[PDB]
Nucleic acid binder design. Structure first.
Ligand SMILES: [Zn+2]
Ligand SMILES: [Zn+2]
Lengths: 78, 81
DNA sequence: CTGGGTCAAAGTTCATC
DNA sequence: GATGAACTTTGACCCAG
């Protein structure tokens, strides 16, 4: 591989919903959109996302997905 | 490989295994024990045979067996909110 | 290449000592 | 405070097209 995840910095093989992303962030974004998940996420504090801490705050992760350009409309409701 | 509805045994204590945890076929007991040990960096005075009935009698030996059977500290992840 | 699905193995909770 | 049965989410890998 040569691409990296725009969300968390993990290895990325391709683009998912408009953005270079890892299998993790692809799966996470899919589930969030499909289930209409809203995250309260205790203390968001610094919404820093990296491979080791991506699962710490779901709110911070989702917000980063949108900030980097992931498209809700690109998630097929199958 | 491992499958959730298939009968397996714990490599540490011989109890019924709920699949592989941290690289080794283990029970929910040895999984939770290893997880807590690594997450808290727990120190065990204890320093013994590890089996279903006597696995809680010596925590030092339970932990040393987890490592000896191939449980990986790096497989334990960071806590989630 | 992109999408989606699967399900093992990561996660957490808490009743009961 | 520890344990571990039961519950929830993640993501590596497969594959349709
Ligand atoms: Zn990612
Ligand atoms: Zn065990």
């Amino acid at each position: 591989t040569k691409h990296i995840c725009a969300i968390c910095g993990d290895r990325s093989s391709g683009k998912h919903y408009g953005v270079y992303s890892c299998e993790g962030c692809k799966g996470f974004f899919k589930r969030t959109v499909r289930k209409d998940l809203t995250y309260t996420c205790r203390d968001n504090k610094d919404c820093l996302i990296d491979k080791r801490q991506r699962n710490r705050c779901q709110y911070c992760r989702y917000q980063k997905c949108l900030a980097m350009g992931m498209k809700r409309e690109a998630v097929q409701e199958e």
